[PDB]
């Protein structure tokens, strides 16, 4: 429906039920990125890797995103 | 260390006072007239300066008291910014 | 009745009419008994209706 | 209009064996009356006998080995004519055991009732079919089809009817729009006092708790895109 | 090789995407101390490429699953069933019982 604020609220309400669920985190990061909202996804990937630091896929997701934008200081 | 004999007393007194305030409010909101024999026993400044005197009113014993009171269904916004991390370690089934 | 005493409570004891009297809302008079009975019948009909 | 079959013990044909198999696959082993209702001219007990004696794939219909056959002579010697116990000792059906014992020790009229009909071989059928067997397979397919309750079937019907009702409700509005009178769409009514409409507000809106990075220009870009989409749906119509 | 963990499939997916990023490449920071916000100056291109990359990858995976659905819906050689969902349940039973014993 091209309404991004309701989709953000629904994803946040979806995380409040179950934060252990990784495909929800990955969809919400991708749903930020595909509409070209990179800073929202940076805040989101920060909150993801700081919530669940022992999960490998989240750090690697944030490393892919910072490589794809060519930000080598951030990847280091 | 074990906690010292003074902190046990300070904690016991402060929390006992709090539990007695809650119990007196719960027994004072009840419709039983018999509950108020089990309870165990203002000015505030509204601006820079105004000096008001907060008085209570004497209500009719027949009209309902707490006229705003009613049974409602409420959801609560669960709001935080404390992110807290989850600090873990690193065919048969 | 004599086997089981029920032993009244001698402290705080809020009574009804002695505390319904302290309000400004109740007032006091003397009337005939039969008038008070008829008024109670009118009031108790009106409440339940 | 069928005359009543009071005694239902017959000869098992091919049709009734196959309907019993495709009924046991769906209904399961322990409901027998619901299996035998599916195929007329047989009884719930005779369905149970036809399964446990003949149609069961766990049952052992082979030729007897030499150790098996000597075991049969010895067990028939030790236990005098207790054939269920013996057949339990051999993991074979008892009728096979009795007939093979007769074959060892050797070396029906018409108008009779055969008691052993459930343990005996089936009869293949004439080429076309009988009429009652056409009716039997028709009602058997009809009863093996359905997996719903009354409530769920009514839900299917109510969803289709509400769908067509909405279509008619939009049809009249489009006709009046062509006429030039714009009847707005009425909303459904609330069944209770705090029933929630979902276009008034984002109903339990959770804000995403901001971080260190800055999202002003991306907010403006989204707001531009959504406003332009709503205008395009207003003019052109999706 | 068997089942693979999540910490390993994560790395293999990361490395495949970087390999894709290298072949795709073949073909600052400002802290506002008033609020505390960080504005990173990213180019408009390489954001469009990231968005179109994610969109094209999701469409590719979607169409692959869509074609797998039809090719698994043609083959009736499993078992007898009565609807579209029983067929999937019976194929699940075949997949477990063939692998187990």
Query: What's the token pair of residue D170?
Result: 């939009």
E-only strand ranges, E1-101? 29-32, 37-40
- The neighbouring-strand residues paired with E31 are E38
φ, ψ at E43 (rounded to 5°):
-75, 155
Q: Cα–Cα distances in Å, from E74 out to B92, D115, D158?
A: 32, 47, 33
Residue B80 contacts by C-beta under 8 Å, 6 or more apart in sequence?
Answer: D209
H helix or E strand, kind and range, residue B4: none
Given an 8 Å threshold on Cβ–Cβ distance, is E50 in contact with A39?
no
Structural contact between residues B36 and B47, judged by C-beta atoms closer than 8 angstroms: no
Distance, CA of C42 to CA of C38 (rounded, Å):
6
3-state secondary structure of B53: strand
The yes-or-no reply on A/B contact (3 CB pairs or more, < 8 Å) is yes
- Which letter does DSSP use for residue D213 in this model? B
CA-based nearest distance B77→chain E, Å: 26
Q: How far is CA D215 from the centre of its chain?
A: 55
Distance, CA of D25 to CA of D37 (rounded, Å):
15
Taking every pair of Cα atoms in chain C, the longest distance, rounded to a whole number of angstroms, is: 45
Distance, CA of D18 to CA of D35 (rounded, Å):
12
Instruction: Give helix A56-68 / helix A22-33 axis angle, nearest 10°.
Output: 10
Distance, CA of A67 to CA of E20 (rounded, Å):
12
φ, ψ at E29 (rounded to 5°):
-125, 135
- CA atoms in the 13 A half-sphere facing the CB of A71: 19
Collect all residues of chain E within an 8 Å Cβ-Cβ radius of residue D213: 37-40
Q: How was this structure determined?
A: cryo-EM
Structural contact between residues D49 and D32, judged by C-beta atoms closer than 8 angstroms: no
Would an 8 Å CB–CB cutoff place D146 in contact with chain E? no
Structural contact between residues A24 and A30, judged by C-beta atoms closer than 8 angstroms: no
> By C-alpha distance, which of A1, A71, A60 is closest to A35?
A1
For residue A3, the chain D residue with the least C-alpha distance is D226
> By C-alpha distance, which of D67, D69, D97 is closest to D82?
D97
CA-based nearest distance E66→chain D, Å: 26
Give me the resolution in angstroms, 1 decimal: 3.3
Structural contact between residues D140 and D23, judged by C-beta atoms closer than 8 angstroms: yes
Torsion angle (degrees, nearest 10) of CA E19, E23, E28, E30: -60
Q: Is the dihedral of CA B31, B33, B34, B37 positive or negative?
A: positive
Distance, CA of D190 to CA of D195 (rounded, Å):
6
> By C-alpha distance, which of B2, B66, B70, B77 is closest to B30?
B66
Instruction: Sort strands E37-40 and B52-53 into parallel, antiparallel or unpaired.
Output: unpaired
Distance, CA of B30 to CA of B20 (rounded, Å):
16
E-only strand ranges, chain B? 43-44, 52-53
Query: What's the token pair of residue D166?
Result: 């909405």
> By C-alpha distance, which of D219, A41, D235, A10 is closest to E51?
A41
Q: What share of chain C is helix, strand, coil (3-state, %, to 5)?
A: 40, 0, 60
The yes-or-no reply on D/C contact (3 CB pairs or more, < 8 Å) is no
> By C-alpha distance, which of D89, D85, D86, D11 is closest to D54?
D11
Distance, CA of D39 to CA of D141 (rounded, Å):
11
Distance, CA of B74 to CA of D102 (rounded, Å):
83
Q: How far is CA E68 from the centre of its chain?
A: 14
Residue B79 contacts by C-beta under 8 Å, 6 or more apart in sequence?
Answer: none
E-only strand ranges, B3-92? 43-44, 52-53
3-state secondary structure of E39: strand
Structural contact between residues D57 and D87, judged by C-beta atoms closer than 8 angstroms: no
H helix or E strand, kind and range, residue E85: helix E84-100
3-state secondary structure of D69: helix
């Amino acid at each position: 429906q091209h309404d991004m604020r309701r989709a953000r609220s629904i994803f946040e309400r979806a995380l409040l039920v179950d934060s252990s669920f990784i495909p929800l985190w990955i969809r919400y990061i991708d749903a930020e990125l595909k509409v070209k909202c990179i800073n929202h996804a940076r805040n989101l990937m920060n909150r993801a890797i700081s919530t669940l630091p022992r999960v490998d896929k989240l750090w690697y997701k944030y490393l892919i995103v910072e490589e794809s934008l060519n930000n080598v200081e951030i990847v280091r | 260390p074990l906690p010292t004999k003074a902190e046990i007393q300070e904690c016991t007194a402060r929390t006992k006072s709090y539990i007695q305030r809650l119990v007196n409010a719960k027994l004072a909101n009840s419709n039983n007239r018999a509950s108020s024999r089990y309870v165990t026993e203002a000015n505030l400044l509204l601006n820079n300066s105004h000096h008001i005197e907060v008085v209570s009113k004497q209500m009719d014993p027949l009209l309902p008291r707490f006229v705003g009171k009613k049974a409602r269904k409420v959801v609560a916004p669960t709001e935080n910014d404390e992110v807290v991390p989850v600090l873990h370690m690193d065919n048969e089934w | 009745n004599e086997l089981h005493p029920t032993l009244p409570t001698n402290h705080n004891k809020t009574k009804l009419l002695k505390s319904l009297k302290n309000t400004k809302y109740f007032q006091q008079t003397t009337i005939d008994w039969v008038e008070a009975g008829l008024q109670l019948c009118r009031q108790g009909h009106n409440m339940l209706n | 209009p069928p005359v009543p079959i009071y005694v239902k013990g017959g000869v098992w044909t091919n049709v009734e064996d196959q309907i019993l198999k495709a009924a046991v696959q769906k209904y399961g082993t322990h409901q027998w009356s619901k299996v035998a209702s599916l195929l007329q001219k047989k009884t719930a007990r005779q369905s149970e006998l036809r399964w446990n004696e003949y149609l069961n794939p766990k049952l052992n219909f082979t030729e007897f080995s030499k150790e098996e056959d000597a075991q049969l002579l010895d067990l028939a010697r030790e236990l005098p004519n207790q054939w269920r116990t013996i057949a339990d000792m051999m993991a074979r059906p008892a009728q096979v055991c009795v007939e093979r014992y007769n074959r060892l020790l050797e070396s029906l009229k018409a108008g009779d009732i055969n008691p052993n009909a459930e343990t005996q071989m089936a009869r293949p059928d004439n080429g076309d079919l009988e009429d009652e067997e056409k009716e039997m397979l028709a009602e058997a397919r009809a009863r093996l089809l359905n997996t719903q309750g009354k409530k769920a079937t009514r839900k299917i019907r109510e969803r289709m009817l509400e769908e067509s009702k909405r279509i008619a409700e939009l049809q009249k509005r489009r006709e009046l729009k062509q006429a030039g009178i714009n009847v707005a769409i009425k909303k459904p009514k609330k069944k209770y006092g705090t029933d929630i409409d979902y276009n008034e507000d984002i109903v339990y809106e959770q804000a995403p708790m901001p971080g260190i990075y800055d999202t002003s220009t991306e907010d403006r870009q989204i707001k531009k895109k959504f406003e332009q989409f709503e205008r395009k749906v207003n003019r052109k119509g999706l | 090789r068997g089942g693979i963990s999540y910490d390993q499939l994560a790395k293999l997916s990361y490395e495949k995407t970087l390999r894709n990023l290298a072949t795709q490449t073949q073909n600052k920071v400002q802290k506002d101390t008033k609020t505390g916000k960080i504005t990173i100056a990213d180019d408009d291109k390489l954001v469009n490429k990231l968005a179109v990359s994610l969109q094209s990858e999701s469409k590719k995976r979607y169409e692959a699953r869509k074609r797998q659905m039809q090719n698994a819906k043609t083959l009736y050689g499993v078992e007898s069933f009565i609807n579209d969902k029983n067929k999937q349940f019976n194929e699940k039973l075949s997949r477990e019982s063939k692998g187990s014993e």
